[PDB]
């Protein structure tokens with residue numbers, strides 16, 4: 001129900017390109033060590049934790065979290081991205097459980113089961129983002145961590161201030177927020193203050 005079929009078709013159409021490091025998803029590949037490092041730091045490590053990756057797509061974050069010893073469920077509504085995720089995980093020799101369903105359906109069946117829920121670059125593609133925020137809150141264990149982010153911009157952006165309003169209506173507490181910026185001194189992208197055009201948000205279930 002809470003799905004934009006057009007948005008899904010778009011990602012389904014480019015699913016084969018997902019793991020091309022120089023293709024359309026290059027920014028996600030480049031960003032991933034950073035968000036993975038952020039998640040591991042904020043959640044206090046990922047080893048042996050149950051982790052749900054909402055709108056996992058081709059599995060860029062999901063696979064990498066499983067590599068750190070997390071028990072990862074990847075969720076998406078796109079058929080082809082999940083086919084690609086499943087195959088790529090097998091090619092890597094990494095175990096990830098990939099499922100095709102909405103986060104609301106998953107929440108109704110798996111409430112409170114996850115130590116960590118990640119929801120990256122997904123919200124802007126959803127007809128009703130508040131519902132996704134509510135589901136993530138429902139999915140997470142007490143004391144669990146929920147992360148939201150939009151680190152990739154191009155040619156629909158949910159402002160962080162608006163997302164905070166959504167988080168405030170749930171059992172999730174905002175813990176930390178940071179932006180992604182180019183650092184000329186180090187010639188690298190780094191997480192830091194300033195969320196005008198992108199962000200990463202750490203919330204914790206209370």
Ligand SMILES: Nc1ncnc2c1ncn2[C@@H]1O[C@H](CSCC[C@H](N)C(=O)O)[C@@H](O)[C@H]1O
Pocket residue numbers: 002003004007008011012028054055056057058059060061075076077078081101102103119120121122125126
């Ligand atoms: N309503 C919905 N339910 C589940 N997945 C959705 C969705 N709307 C969009 N998506 C998925 O969200 C993904 C956005 S691309 C982001 C991929 C991944 N989260 C990452 O950052 O690495 C696409 O795979 C798309 O199919």
